[PDB]
RNA sequence: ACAAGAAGCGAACGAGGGGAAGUGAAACAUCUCAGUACCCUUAGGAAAAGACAUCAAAUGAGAUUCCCCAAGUAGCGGCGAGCGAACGGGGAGAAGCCGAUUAAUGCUAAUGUAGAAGAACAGCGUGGGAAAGCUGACCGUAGUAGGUGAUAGUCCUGUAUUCGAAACAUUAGCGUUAACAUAUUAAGUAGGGCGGGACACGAGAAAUCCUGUCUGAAGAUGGGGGGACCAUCCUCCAAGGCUAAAUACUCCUGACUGACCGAUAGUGAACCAGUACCGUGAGGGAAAGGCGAAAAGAACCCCUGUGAGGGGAGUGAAAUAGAACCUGAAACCGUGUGCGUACAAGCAGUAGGAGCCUCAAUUUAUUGGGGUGACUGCGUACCUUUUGUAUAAUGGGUCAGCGACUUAUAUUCUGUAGCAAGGUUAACCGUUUAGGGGAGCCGUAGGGAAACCGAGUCUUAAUAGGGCGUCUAG
């Protein structure tokens, strides 16, 4: 609802987005899928008519003495194929619109309960210099934090590129997984309108 | 993609209800003069297809 | 979420998958609850839908019946409690098919008595129940 | 994600063998014949374990049948001597008394005598 | 008798000429497998197709190709096993022409093929060695790179960033040159008979396309199609040739990535591997990585045959790290110590149990831990398969390593979560897990073969009777 900015000014934020609820059930399933979208899947392993070989009988049925074979690239075999070889595959879930938007919302809310949300009016660099923002991030008190602005600029995106716990997102490339990950998350007013609007 | 095929023949003669499938009766194509006429009177018409059958007809229908 | 340790999926959400041949004491070992020796026991067993072991299967011991009709697959019944995606008052064919009530490939549309309507429509070129029609003129429709 | 099994069945396999020692030959060596004697020891040992019970009331009966006879009647007329005069005592103190100590059971015999 | 080309080889993808069988149908011949494998011909960066003698039947649309739906629907089918559309909707890409050809040459522009610079750390303690510990600094458009004697943004190579080309390919624009091509509306053609083939469509009521054989028009007052066929209506003009993109692929070149492997794995091949080896041949086809940070790879002495091998010395943090070299398991084989064992019959253990030996306490043989096991009781391995196995029924010499319920899609039920009489988008676009995209799907109504009607409906002459439905959660 009303929150408080670092210097003083009084925003609202709607509880539609902002305040609802703690579903851990429903967060869960969200952010593991976009874990599972990180996925690249790409591996494989030969089978039986991929291994080099084996398509003759190695020796005849009955009479030796021996286990029957059919080929020397049995999975039974070393240097045989692999049964139940592995194939390249896709890990990417779906995930419901609604139930994106509200873990997005879920995850706002828990966020500003446990007082990990920092309003700022707005929070620009006159250079391109990582120590510019190093010292604003102290002021700020959050020295390894998550900033979501509008329009992020073009020499603030190099002033955060370097700091290791540190990371710049406009608020249309802001994932469920950066609202968790980070401590703290430094977003501006005019990004909080917009997540208001989003979700 | 690769989807389930439905049993093209027996969709022929299995129609979806409400709570169920319905059918025809057999005994009814050929040599009916010997046949009482209350044979030819209840051998003709829709029955319901036994609950006993009716999981095979579902996994022989899956779309109906 | 507090952090990514502290995600727990919700319990009675996950269930654990079956592994067979895993030992005696897993409860699926040495066969997979496949039984012992027999066709269905066997590595590329099925239960084959429509086979009853010889004896003719149902579907052929009873005859083939009907015919498939073409219009009724282009004909749409529309019930009354849909009626609430419509843009505006108008209710004909091609406004169900922008309400997307119908199918756009539908020819014509049948509007039964299901729900209730909520506002006064006007039906053009749509066949009304007789049900359906004397709820609709309770709301202050008409039909034309 | 490929899992080599070589270091938990080396492990599992030496719990089984570490539990086989003192076995003969092969039954505290190779796995194949140590994993079978040590289950077979398992079921000796549980029935063994009811046995047990069973082993030791023949020992305190015998000893104490050995007591009666010393002095005055046999077991079977003893327990029934006891029994009339509501003594409890189990044949596990019996025999110990009797083996330990034949003062207190001759005067345990009387009581047992007088009551018969 | 003179000039210009071709030849052959080499991945996959295309087009075309031929074309199986194993299998499934619980047999098998129609059918399936499948126009697949294979053989053969031949091209290009793509190929093919492509502008209506096409659909449609709506208010009409407007070439070809590819994707999501339509839909496992309509159909085909020993109507079996199976096969399986199209119309149309949503997208990608859009283009129509009569040379949208090919090959050179010269300018213009941009790449590519070598490169260059590139910040910032010290002290102390431990340590063989510092990068790790403690204290205090610095750079950052450069902080998760690889190394360096252990783990480094500040030691090195690097990274962010800014840039070089004498020369020669490559891409694009303009101009020129020379090779080829440049139809003028289409007769052995459309249609027909016979036999086949292709169409999802197996002759079927079989339209349409192809053609081996035999024939054969009309020719804009005309002709093709609209799934037998006729009439009406609509649509379009074959028998001339072209046409980019969206689509398919990887012998390859670069950059980058991986809940991919890590030496029985991953390529057959991490190593002098298509090798050794086997085969007349086609062909088949292995095994095999690791000293150490640095060879500092052990001068010299001793035993031995100037041998092997070792012991010293020395090097090294380490030498049971010494070259068969990191770690060094098990099977298996020795040596030493303690106990038991040469009058006693068997799955070799188990429950008791004397004695002996050995450690720790304890005021000194009393317990506790460890080893052994005289003697007593009980006791016929395991797996598999079976009515039933100690079975003289199967399998295993042992150890180590590997070895068998997976994956993709469809569907049904259950749980859980979000929304909820609604739920949800797919392909795609996207500055790409967002956002958009509502085509479509499921649910919300059923009855009947169907027309049709609809909380009803079907059967019926019947308003009777009866069948199937009705009075929510997806």
């Given at each position: 609802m009303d929150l408080k900015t670092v210097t003083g000014a009084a925003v609202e934020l709607s509880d539609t987005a902002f305040g609802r609820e703690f579903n851990e059930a429903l967060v869960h399933q969200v952010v593991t899928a976009y874990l599972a979208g990180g996925r690249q899947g790409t591996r494989a392993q030969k089978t039986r008519a991929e291994?080099?070989?084996?398509?003759?009988?190695?020796?005849?049925?009955?009479?030796?003495?021996?286990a029957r074979a059919?080929?020397?690239?049995?999975?039974?075999?070393?240097?045989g194929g692999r049964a139940f070889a592995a194939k390249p595959q896709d890990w990417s879930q779906k995930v419901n619109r609604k139930m994106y938007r509200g873990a997005m919302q879920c995850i706002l809310a828990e966020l500003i309960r446990q007082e990990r949300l920092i309003l700022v009016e707005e929070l620009t660099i006159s250079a391109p210099k990582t120590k510019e923002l190093i010292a604003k991030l102290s002021e700020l008190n959050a020295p390894r934090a998550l900033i979501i602005t509008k329009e992020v600029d073009e020499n603030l995106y190099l002033a955060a590129?370097?700091?290791?716990?540190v990371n710049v997102l406009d608020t249309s490339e802001v994932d469920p997984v950066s609202l968790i990950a980070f401590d703290k998350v430094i977003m501006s007013v005019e990004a909080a309108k917009q997540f208001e609007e989003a979700l | 993609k690769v989807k389930m095929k439905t049993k093209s023949g027996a969709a022929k003669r299995f129609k979806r209800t409400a709570n169920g499938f319905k059918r025809k009766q057999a005994?009814?194509?050929?040599?009916?003069?010997?046949?009482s006429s209350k044979r030819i009177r209840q051998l003709r018409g829709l029955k319901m297809v036994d609950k006993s059958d009716e999981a095979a007809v579902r996994r022989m229908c899956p779309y109906i | 979420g507090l952090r990514l340790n502290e995600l727990?999926?919700?319990?009675?959400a996950k269930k654990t998958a079956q592994r067979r041949?895993?030992?005696?004491?897993?409860?699926?070992?040495?066969?997979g609850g496949r039984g012992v020796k027999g066709q269905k026991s066997?590595?590329?067993?099925?239960?084959?839908?429509?086979?009853?072991?010889?004896?003719?299967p149902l579907y052929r011991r009873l005859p083939k019946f009907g015919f498939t009709s073409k219009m009724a697959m282009t004909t749409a019944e529309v019930r009354?409690?849909?009626?609430?995606?419509?843009?505006?008052d108008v209710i004909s064919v091609a406004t169900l098919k922008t309400a997307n009530?119908?199918?756009?490939?539908?020819?014509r549309a049948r509007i039964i008595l299901s729900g209730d309507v909520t506002k006064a429509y006007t039906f053009q070129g749509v066949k009304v129940t007789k049900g359906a029609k004397q709820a609709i003129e309770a709301a202050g429709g008409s039909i034309e | 994600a490929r899992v080599k099994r070589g270091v938990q069945a080396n492990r599992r396999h030496k719990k089984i063998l570490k539990r086989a020692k003192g076995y003969y030959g092969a039954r505290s060596r190779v796995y194949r014949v140590a994993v079978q004697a040590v289950t077979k020891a398992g079921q000796y040992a549980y029935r063994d374990r009811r046995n047990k019970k069973r082993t030791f009331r023949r020992l305190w009966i015998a000893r104490i049948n050995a007591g009666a006879r010393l002095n005055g009647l046999s077991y079977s007329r003893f327990i029934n001597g006891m029994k009339k005069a509501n003594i409890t005592i189990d044949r596990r103190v019996l025999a110990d008394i009797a083996m330990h100590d034949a003062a207190t059971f001759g005067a345990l015999v009387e009581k047992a005598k007088a009551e018969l």
């Open positions: 291994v080099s070989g084996g398509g003759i009988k190695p020796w005849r049925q009955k009479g030796t003495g021996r059919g080929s020397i690239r049995s999975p039974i075999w070393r240097g590129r370097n700091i290791p716990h | 005994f009814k194509s050929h040599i009916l003069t010997k046949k | 727990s999926p919700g319990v009675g041949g895993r030992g005696i004491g897993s409860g699926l070992g040495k066969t066997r590595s590329g067993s099925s239960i084959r839908a429509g086979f009853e072991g010889g004896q003719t009354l409690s849909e009626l609430n995606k419509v843009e505006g009530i119908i199918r756009h490939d539908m020819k | -």
